[PDB]
C-alpha cells in the first residue's frame, strides 16, 4: 500500500521536566511514527512532511519545531506568545520538513518562557503528516521573513528566506507563489508581531481571506490558511493593510507554507476531498450549537454541508481539519466527531481582553464512512466573521489513492 504516516497528540498527563514538550495522549497515530512517551516523531518513510502545533499558555511561551538527523540536533524557527496576563492564549507554528529515515521531529520549549497550561478546560496539540514520499509532479514550500524591519503598509509581504522550495514555486524576489502544477493546494501562515497586524491572502489579484491580531508591546502569532484549487499561472501571496507589524521578539518568527494536495487529472476524482468555508453570520452562538460556516470557498466532492456546518465522511481515511477564528473576546470551541450523536475530541480556548485576536486549532482524525466532524460553540462564544476579520473551517483527505 501507499505509506500513510500521520498523527495528532495532545497533553493530558504529560511527564514532567526537560525542554521537549511531550504530548502524552494520542488522538491519531497511523503507522505509529509518534512516540508519546518522548514527544518525538520518528521518520520511517523519507519525504516531505508538514508539522504544526497549537499550544495553550497563560503566561509566556516560546516553542520551536526541532529535528535531528543521525542524532544531531537541527534548531529552527520559533513562535512565542508573551501576553503574560493569565488568560488563555494559543501559540501556533508549522512548517514543511524534508526528512530521511530515522530523523526525529519534536517541539521544544524555551527554558525561560515555557508556560503550558495543565488542566481539563482546553487542549494543546502537535500534528504531522506525510505530504509526499521521496523518489512525481509535486509542489511544496516553506519560506520565512528574515528581517527585523516590517513590511510597508498596504503592500505585499516578501518572505526572503527559504526553508524548502524544491520546485521554485515561491519566488523570493517577487514575493509570490505561481502555480506550475494545477490542482488543490493548502496555504497557511504563522506570523509573529508586537503591534497590530492584519494578513491578507490574495489569489490572482482578489483578496480571499484576512486575519488580524492586535497587541501592544508583547508578542503574538497571527495565523491563517485556506484550501484553493488553482490553475496554471495563478499567483498567490500575502499582504498587509494599515496594520503591518511583523516585528517578532527574539525567538518568534514568521513562516508561510503551501503544498499541492490533489493534482488535477491524477485520477480517482471522487477521492479528491477538500473544503474551506468561512462564516459570515454574527448571530450570538449558544452553548452546544453547531457553528455554521456558510460561505464555501472550496468543497471538492461536496462532503461539507454549509447549511449545517458539518463535514460528513464518504471516503474512510485520515483527514486533517483546521480552523482560524477571528474574535474580540473569549472563545472556546469543541471539535466534534461522531454520527447521530457526536463526541468531543478536544476543546480549543483562546481568550482576549478588550482587543481583536485570531486563534487556530487543527487535528488529524481517522474517519469512518458516515461520521461527521464539526465545530461546536460553548459559553465562551466571541466569534467574529466578516470581510477583513474572517473565520474559516477547512479539511482535507490526506492519502487519496495513487
Ligand atoms: C493507546 C496507547 O498506547 N496509550 C498510551 C498509554 O497507555 C500510556 O499511558 C501513555 C504514556 O504517556 O502513552 C500512550 O500512548
Ligand atoms: Ca488570545
Numbering used by the authors: 2 to 136, 142 to 408
Can you quote the paper on this entry?
The C1q molecule is a complex defense collagen, being assembled from six heterotrimeric subunits, each consisting of three homologous, yet distinct polypeptide chains (A–C) encoded by the C1QA, C1QB, and C1QC genes oriented in the A–C–B order on human chromosome 1p. C1q also features the most versatile recognition properties, being able to identify not only bacterial and viral pathogens, either directly or through other immune proteins such as antibodies and pentraxins, but also many altered self elements, including β-amyloid fibrils, the pathological form of the prion protein, modified low-density lipoproteins, and apoptotic cells. We report here, the production of a single-chain recombinant form of human C1q globular region (C1q-scGR). The three monomers have been linked in tandem to generate a single continuous polypeptide, based on a strategy previously used to generate a single-chain form of the homotrimeric globular domain of adiponectin, a protein structurally related to C1q.
